[PDB]
Design a protein around this ligand. Structure first.
Ligand SMILES: Nc1ncnc2c1ncn2[C@@H]1O[C@H](COP(=O)(O)OP(=O)(O)NP(=O)(O)O)[C@@H](O)[C@H]1O
Ligand SMILES: Nc1ncnc2c1ncn2[C@@H]1O[C@H](COP(=O)(O)OP(=O)(O)NP(=O)(O)O)[C@@H](O)[C@H]1O
Ligand SMILES: [Mn+2]
Ligand SMILES: [Mn+2]
Ligand SMILES: [Mn+2]
Ligand SMILES: [Zn+2]
Lengths: 173, 1009, 173
């Protein structure tokens, strides 16, 4: 059908893996056109787990992760360790609203088991250390989006929304 | 000095409940001077609402005399539906400056020499970025959680203007605008192009005139409609800043911040470059100080005429700007076609166009220092003027309403018509002149040849300067039509609506700047004709099966490529334009055409697909007794029991009106202050009638004084007397006291409703014509009417089976994802639905929808349930009409509408019944005869009053025409004894509900022939 | 740590035996002391699972589940699908908060899967049908909450708030 997967943008290079299709059909929700990154899907109450990279259940009502969506299935080595769900593309927290969706989604999401064993007192870990972006903008914005650095010159624009808008939180252990 | 209202606005932040008695000005400012309070913002807090005079005279100023750790949140109207603000609070104290940095994220790009921007650009985004912090919408006073915090922060800034008008020495005015004949102006049209653009004309022409106001005084001088979710103010401010000049990255702080809340669609004010929905009310009020802005300062003159004419001149100046902009455009475009005509006529007539096809009234009442003050304080009967002055305004309005000046009575035609001094294009009329087929009340200047050689016939008349322009002529103008100047203006403005921008900005650009910005950008805009919306499913049956059932139609450019750019305000045109089928066809040319018909009728049969239905559905709504609620009466609470006329000497209804406000007022409190009232209220006739009933029980106020004592005196022989006089002037006369907060809250609640029903309409294959605060207008396919109403009514009261765009429609409130905003369940709302042939003149359909619900609201009583007993209400009906088959569905069957927090399924339950019936008629469970056999059971049912006999009669009528024998669909018992008391009118309405349930389905299943 | 039990509160007649630590320790969070139901947890991004009731993992921010929090462990036949997360008793968005907690909580939460083989759109529903709230105040209340029915003759003050504070987002699927 019309498959995708929410991939977040961290400041670690451990999130260059879970994209297989890279195309899906020919479309992608979170697009790049003359204005940078639009359709940023910020998750509520989830945090990231770069080391063994997933999204963790958290409960500070403000806990966000801010990433993107690309039309793909992550690695096919999942569907028990990755979240799979079908909602009619209306329950979304999709910011920088630039496109429209067909009112249905078939998503595949990284996610881990809760493990009520320790204190997961998360930390604000924002997107700094811009050095990571310059391989992020290759491994994803170039190795997935076959138009960045091939049809525009304002690559510093997309290299700026990822500095002010793109952030996240993490369990960080 | 004015425009410093930021501290008048933010006299205390939404952190109010987070500085009041635990659960954690504490912060005054970091980017302005010090907020002064000698009596300056004192008055702004005390006179803005009743919460400072309802609960005593000092408690609200102390914010600690009846405190409590839990903070309720009540509806302003029916204080029974609760919400709790709990622990979650504005972002942490340690980061309370970060949000201020989030404050300062776009207030530092343009010069700070002027406040006419630095005060109002933040106004509209104040509420926005704050709900991004997800503040959860605290109330203003926790001892009275009836007004949310932001609402009072704006209501105080409202009458701050009058504060400053007394700060000069004295002045202050309540000005009200209202265009004269709307429902008449809208009537003129032929294809719904003219319909929607005449609506948009009313809207934009009234939007032009108050731009000047918000530029001389800044917003929050306006009361109605609230400049909160204005789809027009949004675009206006936005383009103001865009012309100020900032990177799309610099405005991107505001662009998405709007589109996610307001304009929840995709095609928006930046793809049509125009707001796709007209939302301005044809009437708007203003609280105006006596100051005058002409540069560098604000001077005053003591007169009232300084506005009565200075508003009329602006209203007509907007029309002049528009007409000259159309002159420039048609000149710049004669080389196309049909624009040669517009130029030719705007040159053949210029003086008739020197007067706008609308009119307005303007009344403007005053205020002074006398009896609002004595030296520096507020006396007895000082909180008792604003609503007084408001009533004065509305009394002037409804007095002048007795006369009606139609716009044409302004035109100077006498010479132009007595002699052949009138210019005619086409056939110089044998009979001296003709009337335009659109107005029928003006002499037309363009008279199309009806039809004999339409190609040559008008090339035979020099109107067609050559063989080419005939297409662009014959397109926008149907054969045989006749156009007056005023309606050729609208046919032109329907050729493209982008020129309405000249009206939007209140002369912010120059006119040439606008028209020459839009001669560069070149894009086609389409408007859904009745023939389109009468084919929605016909395209869906051809969208799912694109060419599967399309092979011969693959050449008729309907099953072919959408070619250039076509985009519509119609949301269902934004979500099927790229489905491969061009929604730019003219269905009156393929199958709604005559010659190409029988072919298609034998074509669709082999693909087993239906003949289309020649019927749309003109839905319009109305809020029953809205004016009384704004005035502050209880007819909205008792729609039908009491009328306006039963307010001349209200002392007879001292049973109803004296109830139903107590239970609101006496309950509007909480904690302990509630008891403070829960005793003091009835002690008038229940007690010694004077200020000694409460003095006995007053002490439970002074039973909390000494922990951090601040008060100056405890001798309250006044705050018992004043809290008695307050309720005495309002139960001796059982009205409510109106506040700026009241009005602004209601207008805001109307704007949230605007958004939500804008999402409702186009949730179905709808097409808004005018979404208003308390009204609506649309065209829907005859399949999506009931289900629409059933929610739109419910949604109006505040109830969601769904998230609409991103708004949570809870029970009683409309919560924007943390912001619980109050809806209007107590307000009634009637509906009027016309099932119209596509080949019906819109003039008549609009007239007989407006008058249908116009007199239907004022004529039809039904048996209702008040206080448990049986009464006869008069409003909240849902009228239908096919062509002579009228039907009426009530909607509440209770008074007040939802007196309990779970009464929210009493509403529109009957349409649930009709849905469960219609759903099963066609599934082959129940025969078609169910609606032909009721004419055999109707008499017994209406002659019965033993509801189980009636239940068995209905069960028998259901069972005797069942296709199976095993369907058991039963009607509720309460829908048995109600009776539709219509009286003395040549209209035909069955006098019992189930007959109307039958006739509604008669209509709807008939709207498919 | 102090193991907890998060009772999900739909209108379902299947909350019979899922809290197994009736008294067990010394303090249960959700407390009723002469003033109604306080210490009320509400976890967002979730909804009910009426067919074998649980908290369905969704992404919508307006979705939630309004459940209570006590110390318990379900039936000792689980730790297969339930949500077993520990947070340091701080991020709990609690409504009508009178006191704080032990600064660390292990909570066992009914936690299903999306089980996505059909459309899943959110449905907001409330508690109604006063026999409904009266069937649960004998199904669960007397079991966990002994302080009712003997200390409060104001039995309605605790039955009232449920019909105005105890919502839940359903599925209707
Ligand atoms: N921009 C608009 N487009 C369409 N309808 C509108 C617009 N503004 C107001 N209306 C409606 O037009 C109708 C007119 O209401 P009303 O107050 O009776 O004025 P009128 O019918 O125009 N003439 P009058 O009553 O003498 O002022 C109401 O339904 C208004 O809500
Ligand atoms: N005080 C007011 N301020 C602004 N708009 C108003 C006011 N009163 C009415 N309107 C609107 O203008 C029209 C008023 O005429 P109408 O709606 O017939 O009166 P009403 O006061 O709503 N009583 P009702 O006859 O039951 O509808 C409606 O479209 C209202 O929404
Ligand atoms: Mn009017
Ligand atoms: Mn009305
Ligand atoms: Mn009217
Ligand atoms: Zn005309």
């Amino acid at each position: 059908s019309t498959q995708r997967e929410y991939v977040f943008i961290p400041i670690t290079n451990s999130i260059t893996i879970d994209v297989k299709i890279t195309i899906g059909g020919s479309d992608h929700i979170t697009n790049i056109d003359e204005r940078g990154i639009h359709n940023v899907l910020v998750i509520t109450g989830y945090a990231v787990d770069e080391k063994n990279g997933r999204l963790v259940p958290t409960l500070d009502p403000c806990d966000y992760v801010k990433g993107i969506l690309v039309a793909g299935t992550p690695q096919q080595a999942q569907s028990n360790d990755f979240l799979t769900l079908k909602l009619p593309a209306n329950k979304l927290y999709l910011i920088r609203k630039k496109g429209n969706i067909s009112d249905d989604l078939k998503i595949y999401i990284p996610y881990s088991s809760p493990d009520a064993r320790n204190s997961m007192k998360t930390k604000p870990v924002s997107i700094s250390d811009d050095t990571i972006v310059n391989n992020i903008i290759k491994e994803v914005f170039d190795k997935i989006y076959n138009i960045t650095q091939k049809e525009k010159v304002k690559i510093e624009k997309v290299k700026e929304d990822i500095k002010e808008l793109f952030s996240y939180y993490a369990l960080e252990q | 000095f004015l425009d410093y209202k930021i501290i008048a606005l933010l006299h205390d932040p939404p952190n109010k409940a987070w500085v009041i008695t635990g659960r954690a000005a504490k912060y005054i400012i970091n980017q302005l001077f010090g907020k002064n309070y000698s009596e300056k913002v004192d008055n702004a807090d005390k006179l803005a609402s009743s919460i400072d005079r309802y609960l005593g005279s000092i408690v609200y100023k102390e914010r600690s005399l009846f405190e409590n750790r839990s903070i309720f949140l009540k509806n302003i109207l029916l204080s029974n539906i609760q919400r709790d603000i709990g622990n979650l609070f504005p972002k942490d104290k340690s980061k309370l400056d970060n949000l201020i940095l989030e404050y300062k994220k776009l207030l530092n790009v343009i010069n700070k020499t002027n406040l006419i921007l630095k005060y109002q650009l933040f106004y509209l985004i104040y509420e926005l970025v704050w709900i991004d912090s997800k503040y959860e919408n605290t109330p203003s006073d926790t001892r009275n959680p009836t007004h949310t915090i932001f609402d009072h922060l704006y209501a105080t800034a409202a009458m701050m203007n009058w504060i400053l008008s007394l700060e000069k020495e004295a002045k202050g005015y309540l000005l009200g605008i209202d265009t004269i004949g709307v429902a008449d102006f809208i009537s003129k049209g032929r294809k719904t192009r003219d319909l929607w653009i005449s609506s948009y004309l009313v809207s934009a022409l009234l939007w032009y005139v108050i731009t000047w106001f918000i530029e001389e005084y800044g917003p929050d001088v306006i009361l109605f409609p609230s400049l909160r979710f204005n789809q027009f103010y949004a675009f206006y401010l936005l383009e103001k800043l865009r012309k100020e000049g900032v990177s799309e990255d610099v405005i991107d702080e505001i662009k998405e911040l709007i589109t996610k809340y307001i304009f929840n669609g995709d095609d928006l004010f930046e793809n049509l470059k125009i707001p796709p929905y007209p939302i301005i009310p044809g009437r708007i009020t203003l609280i105006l100080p006596g100051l005058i802005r002409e540069g560098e300062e604000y001077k005053k003159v003591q007169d009232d005429n300084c506005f009565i004419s200075k508003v009329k001149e602006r209203y007509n100046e907007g029309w002049r700007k528009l007409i000259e902009g159309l002159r420039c455009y048609s000149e710049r475009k004669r080389e196309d076609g049909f624009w040669n005509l517009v130029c030719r006529v705007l040159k053949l007539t210029e003086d008739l166009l020197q007067t706008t096809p609308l009119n307005i009234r303007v009344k403007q009442v005053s205020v002074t220092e006398d009896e609002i003050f004595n030296n520096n304080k507020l006396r007895s009967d000082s909180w008792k003027i604003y609503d007084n002055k408001y009533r004065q305004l509305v009394s002037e309005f409804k007095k002048s309403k007795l006369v009606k000046v139609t716009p044409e009575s302004r035109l100077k035609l006498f010479e132009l018509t007595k002699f052949d001094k009138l210019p005619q294009i086409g056939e110089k009329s044998k009979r001296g002149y003709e009337f335009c087929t659109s107005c029928g009340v003006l002499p037309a200047v363009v008279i199309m040849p009806k039809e004999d050689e339409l190609e040559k016939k008008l090339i035979d008349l020099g109107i067609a300067r050559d063989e080419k322009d005939v297409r662009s002529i014959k397109n926008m103008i149907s054969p045989g039509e006749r156009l007056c100047p005023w309606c050729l203006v609208k046919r032109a403005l329907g050729a493209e609506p982008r020129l309405m921008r000249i009206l939007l900005l209140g002369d912010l650009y120059s006119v040439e700047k606008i028209v020459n910005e839009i001669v560069s950008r070149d894009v086609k805009i389409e408007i859904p004709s009745t023939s389109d919306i009468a084919s929605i499913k016909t395209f869906e049956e051809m969208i799912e099966k694109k060419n599967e059932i399309c092979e011969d139609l693959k050449e008729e450019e309907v099953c072919e490529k959408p070619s250039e750019s076509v985009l519509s305000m119609w949301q269902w045109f934004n979500k099927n334009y790229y489905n491969g089928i061009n929604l730019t066809i003219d269905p009156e040319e393929y199958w709604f055409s005559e010659k190409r018909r029988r072919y298609y009728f034998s074509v669709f049969r082999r693909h087993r697909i239906t003949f289309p239905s020649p019927y749309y559905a003109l839905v319009r709504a109305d809020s029953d007794y809205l004016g009384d609620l704004l005035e502050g009466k209880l007819t909205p609470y008792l729609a039908g029991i009491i009328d306006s006329g039963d307010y001349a000497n209200i002392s007879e209804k001292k049973e109803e009106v004296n109830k139903l406000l107590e239970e609101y007022l006496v309950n509007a409190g909480s904690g302990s202050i509630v008891d403070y009232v829960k005793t003091v209220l009835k002690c008038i006739r229940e007690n010694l009638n004077k200020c000694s009933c409460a003095e006995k029980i007053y002490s439970n106020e002074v039973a909390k004084v000494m922990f951090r004592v601040n008060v100056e005196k405890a001798n309250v022989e006044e705050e018992v007397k004043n809290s008695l006089e307050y309720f005495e002037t309002i139960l001796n006369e059982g009205r409510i006291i109106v506040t700026p907060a009241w009005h602004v809250s209601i207008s805001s609640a109307l704007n949230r409703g605007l958004l939500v029903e804008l999402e409702l309409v186009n949730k179905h294959k709808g097409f808004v014509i005018y979404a208003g605060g308390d009204d609506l207008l649309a065209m829907l396919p005859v399949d999506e009417v009931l289900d629409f109403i059933k929610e739109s009514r419910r949604a109006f009261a505040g109830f969601g089976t769904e998230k609409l765009g991103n708004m949570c429609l809870e029970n009683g409130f409309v919560r924007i994802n943390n912001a619980y905003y109050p809806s209007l369940p107590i307000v009634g709302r009637s509906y009027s639905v016309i099932i119209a042939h596509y080949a019906d003149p819109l003039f008549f359909v609009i007239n007989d929808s407006y008058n249908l619900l116009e007199e239907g609201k004022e004529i039809i009583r039904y048996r209702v349930m008040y206080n448990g007993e049986y009464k006869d209400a008069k409003k909240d009906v849902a009228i239908f009409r096919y062509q002579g088959l009228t039907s009426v569905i009530p909607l509440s069957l209770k008074r007040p509408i939802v007196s309990s927090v779970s009464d929210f399924n009493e509403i529109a339950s009957i349409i649930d019944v009709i849905l469960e019936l219609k759903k099963r008629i066609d599934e082959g469970r129940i025969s078609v005869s169910l609606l032909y056999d009721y004419e055999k059971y109707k008499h017994l049912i209406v002659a019965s009053d033993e509801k189980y006999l009636t239940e068995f009669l209905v069960k028998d009528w259901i069972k005797r025409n069942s296709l199976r024998k095993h369907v058991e669909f039963t009607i509720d018992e309460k829908l048995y004894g109600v009776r539709l008391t219509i009286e003395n009118y040549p209209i035909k309405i069955p006098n019992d509900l189930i007959s109307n349930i039958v006739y509604t389905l008669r209509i709807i299943y008939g709207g498919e022939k």
